[PDB]
Amino acid sequence: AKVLVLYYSMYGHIETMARAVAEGASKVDGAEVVVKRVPETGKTQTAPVATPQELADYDAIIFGTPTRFGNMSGQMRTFLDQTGGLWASGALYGKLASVFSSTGGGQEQTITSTWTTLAHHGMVIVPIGYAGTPYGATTIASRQPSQEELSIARYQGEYVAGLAVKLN
Closest CB to its own copies among residues 48, 105: 105
* CA gap 132, 129 in Å, rounded: 9
Q: How far is CA 4 from CA 85, 135, 143, 149, in A?
A: 19, 19, 26, 20
CB atoms within 10 A of CB 34: 17
**10 is annotated as contributing to ligand binding:** yes
Closest CB to its own copies among residues 48, 85: 85
Q: Where are the alpha helices (DSSP H) in 30-146?
A: 74-81, 84-89, 107-119
- In the stretch 112-141, what mask flags binding to its own copies with x, by CB under 8 A? xx-xxx-xxxxxxxxxxxxxxxxx------
Which 40-69 residues touch its own copies, going by CB under 8 A?
68-69
**Residues at the site binding its own copies, with contacts judged by CB under 8 A:** 68-71, 74, 77-78, 80-81, 83, 87, 90, 93-94, 103, 105-109, 112-113, 115-117, 119-135, 163, 166-167
